[PDB]
Amino acid sequence: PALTKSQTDRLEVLLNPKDEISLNSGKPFRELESELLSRRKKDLQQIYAEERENYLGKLEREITRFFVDRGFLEIKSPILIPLEYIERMGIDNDTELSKQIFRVDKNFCLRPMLAPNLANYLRKLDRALPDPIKIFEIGPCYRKESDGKEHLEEFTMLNFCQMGSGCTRENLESIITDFLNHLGIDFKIVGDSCMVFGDTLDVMHGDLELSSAVVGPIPLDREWGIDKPWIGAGFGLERLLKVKHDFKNIKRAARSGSYYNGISTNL
Amino acid sequence: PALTKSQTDRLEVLLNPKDEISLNSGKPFRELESELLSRRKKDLQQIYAEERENYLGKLEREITRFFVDRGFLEIKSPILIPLEYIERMGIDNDTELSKQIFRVDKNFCLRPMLAPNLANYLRKLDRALPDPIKIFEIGPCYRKESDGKEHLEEFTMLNFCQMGSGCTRENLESIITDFLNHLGIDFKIVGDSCMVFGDTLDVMHGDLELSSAVVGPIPLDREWGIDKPWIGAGFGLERLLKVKHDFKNIKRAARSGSYYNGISTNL
Ligand SMILES: Nc1ncnc2c1ncn2[C@@H]1O[C@H](COP(=O)(O)OP(=O)(O)OP(=O)(O)O)[C@@H](O)[C@H]1O
Ligand SMILES: Nc1ncnc2c1ncn2[C@@H]1O[C@H](COP(=O)(O)OP(=O)(O)OP(=O)(O)O)[C@@H](O)[C@H]1O
Ligand SMILES: C[Si](C)(C)COC(=O)NCCCC[C@H](N)C(=O)O
Ligand SMILES: C[Si](C)(C)COC(=O)NCCCC[C@H](N)C(=O)O
Ligand SMILES: [Mg+2]
Ligand SMILES: [Mg+2]
Ligand SMILES: [Mg+2]
Numbered sequence: 001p002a003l004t005k006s007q008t009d010r011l012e013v014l015l016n017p018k019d020e021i022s023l024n025s026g027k028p029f030r031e032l033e034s035e036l037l038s039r040r041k042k043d044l045q046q047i048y049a050e051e052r053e054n055y056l057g058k059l060e061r062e063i064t065r066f067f068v069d070r071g072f073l074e075i076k077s078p079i080l081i082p083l084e085y086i087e088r089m090g091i092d093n094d095t096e097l098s099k100q101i102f103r104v105d106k107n108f109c110l111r112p113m114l115a116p117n118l119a120n121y122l123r124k125l126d127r128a129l130p131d132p133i134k135i136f137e138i139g140p141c142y143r144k145e146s147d148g149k150e151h152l153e154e155f156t157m158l159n160f161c162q163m164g165s166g167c168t169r170e171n172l173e174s175i176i177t178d179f180l181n182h183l184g185i186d187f188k189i190v191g192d193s194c195m196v197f198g199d200t201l202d203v204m205h206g207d208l209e210l211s212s213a214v215v216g217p218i219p220l221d222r223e224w225g226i227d228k229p230w231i232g233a234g235f236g237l238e239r240l241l242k243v244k245h246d247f248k249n250i251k252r253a254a255r256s257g258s259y260y261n262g263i264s265t266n267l
Numbered sequence: 268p269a270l271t272k273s274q275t276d277r278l279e280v281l282l283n284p285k286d287e288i289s290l291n292s293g294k295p296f297r298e299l300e301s302e303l304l305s306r307r308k309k310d311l312q313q314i315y316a317e318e319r320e321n322y323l324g325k326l327e328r329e330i331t332r333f334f335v336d337r338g339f340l341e342i343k344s345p346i347l348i349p350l351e352y353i354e355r356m357g358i359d360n361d362t363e364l365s366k367q368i369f370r371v372d373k374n375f376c377l378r379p380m381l382a383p384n385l386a387n388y389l390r391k392l393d394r395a396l397p398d399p400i401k402i403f404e405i406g407p408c409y410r411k412e413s414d415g416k417e418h419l420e421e422f423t424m425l426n427f428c429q430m431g432s433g434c435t436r437e438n439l440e441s442i443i444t445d446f447l448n449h450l451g452i453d454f455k456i457v458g459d460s461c462m463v464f465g466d467t468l469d470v471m472h473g474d475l476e477l478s479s480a481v482v483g484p485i486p487l488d489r490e491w492g493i494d495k496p497w498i499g500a501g502f503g504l505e506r507l508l509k510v511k512h513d514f515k516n517i518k519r520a521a522r523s524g525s526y527y528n529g530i531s532t533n534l
């Protein structure tokens with residue numbers, strides 16, 4: 001009555017966090033699979049009858065309303081960006097993040113972060129809008145990754161940011177606090193450091209990094225024409241979903257043809 | 268008192284459809300530019316004070332609510348897809364659409380359409396959901412294009428589709444009709460033809476193609492495991508915005524760092 005690795009992997013695809021089912025109790029694979037298949041078909045039928053919204057889409061909409069209502073302008077900027085942005089962000093051609101970049105043709109890449117486009121918007125909008133400038137964006141970003149439990153190659157970033165008055169550590173933490181309180185997600189702030197921005201305030205849920213946040217100014221500002229105080233933070237939406245729904249693997253949360261709202265589509 | 272091409276191009280960037288300003292009345296460039304700059308700064312200040320929603324984001328949300336309320340499941344599938352999907356869609360390696368594909372690395376590409384991922388979802392969901400299967404997706408798609416007035420290289424597609432009962436020409440036209448009536452956009456349906464799907468019902472606003480729609484079955488179905496009647500239609504959101512806002516160029520509607528809700532960001 002032992003299960004093979006293939007059998008265990010199939011049952012794990014079909015298992016969901018709310019289940020409490022022992023995969024190696026000695027019940028045969030056929031019965032465990034049939035039970036989980038029936039649970040998951042019922043779950044998908046209930047989604048189709050009663051809500052029909054995609055978790056990533058619904059969370060984006062929820063986050064958008066939060067930031068629009070707090071005075072931030074909603075941005076939708078290019079996902080396909082100049083490759084020259086990477087070197088200008090101080091991503092040394094090197095190894096690290098630089099090796100994670102998906103190149104497109106000769107001179108383009110898929111953005112790995114929203115920051116460069118938002119920096120350009122802060123600079124441009126400061127010529128027309130009253131102080132402070134508050135903007136945010138949600139959308140796809142791309143990195144080649146090796147890991148699998150907390151990393152996706154195609155994921156969804158929120159970055160909000162502000163330039164002008166009010167760009168203090170305490171106001172940044174207060175926005176993060178109000179935001180994650182709105183989502184019902186507990187967290188702590190820990191110092192960390194990265195090659196692009198320097199010191200970061202990392203927003204942690206246990207050992208899971210939900211965000212890196214930054215208080216400017218930083219030396220990179222000159223190369224982007226940023227010449228005022230600023231604050232900003234980038235969050236992964238699939239990581240937020242992973243926490244909210246207690247997923248074991250971030251792939252449950254991803255754009256995917258393999259899962260719908262964390263339910264296997266292989267039924 | 269004549270304007271150069273550079274001067275005329277600058278004024279056209281700053282002009283908006285609601286203006287009624289003659290660029291070559293003989294008023295000097297400096298006064299025309301100052302007047303338009305003041306109008307556009309006021310327009311952006313009003314957006315920032317009172318709405319703050321991005322046109323593409325807001326239209327996606329409006330469309331999503333429409334289709335969710337009509338019983339369609341909201342899908343968010345990969346934008347970065349296998350290159351093998353292109354050949355399997357019958358996009359002959361050839362010239363035409365095939366030359367329009369943005370390749371990523373060796374084996375991936377940016378999707379040029381939502382159809383292949385939605386075909387996979389229809390097939391998979393038919394194993395779990397009751398007839399008919401109704402799904403839709405909105406999101407970025409990518410084509411190398413030459414044109415500039417009605418084409419973008421990075422644009423936003425809506426595709427809705429249905430499989431099972433009810434997949435008739437009359438029901439397809441009725442959905443299109445209810446949808447564009449909800450948006451307030453007049454249209455007509457004209458026959459056309461394309462290499463992937465064959466005969467299409469093209470949804471036209473004047474000479475502007477808003478959508479191609481298709482009544483299955485088609486011979487491509489076998490290669491995607493589709494084995495029931497189906498209907499579907501793909502719409503460009505920036506083209507819908509172009510019509511709604513009377514933009515002269517689709518770039519006003521695009522993801523862009525150069526325009527915000529059709530207003531130049533170069534102020
Ligand atoms: N590959 C990925 N998949 C999913 N989410 C990610 C990925 N990379 C980054 N994020 C999310 O985006 C946020 C901001 O990006 P940032 O550059 O700080 O990530 P990071 O420090 O490289 O994250 P990690 O150390 O976990 O790799 C991260 O805190 C995380 O929530
Ligand atoms: N490059 C583009 N930019 C903006 N919208 C586009 C683009 N290509 C297609 N669309 C939109 O997507 C819809 C469905 O795609 P489809 O493949 O039918 O386009 P198409 O027939 O190639 O359009 P066209 O003949 O105008 O090039 C189109 O009706 C249009 O509204
Ligand atoms: C020219 Si700048 C990149 C140095 C300053 O202005 C911005 O572009 N603001 C949004 C991004 C800030 C960092 C982001 N918060 C993060 O740590 O993920
Ligand atoms: C395996 Si199929 C591609 C042959 C059938 O099922 C679907 O994938 N449905 C959505 C896409 C249909 C065509 C789209 N409406 C268009 O003309 O843009
Ligand atoms: Mg990382
Ligand atoms: Mg980190
Ligand atoms: Mg980080």
Ligand SMILES: [Mg+2]
Nearest residue numbers: 364410412418
């Ligand atoms: Mg075309």
Ligand SMILES: [Mg+2]
Nearest residue numbers: 459469476479
């Ligand atoms: Mg056409």
Ligand SMILES: [Mg+2]
Nearest residue numbers: 461476478479
């Ligand atoms: Mg067409």
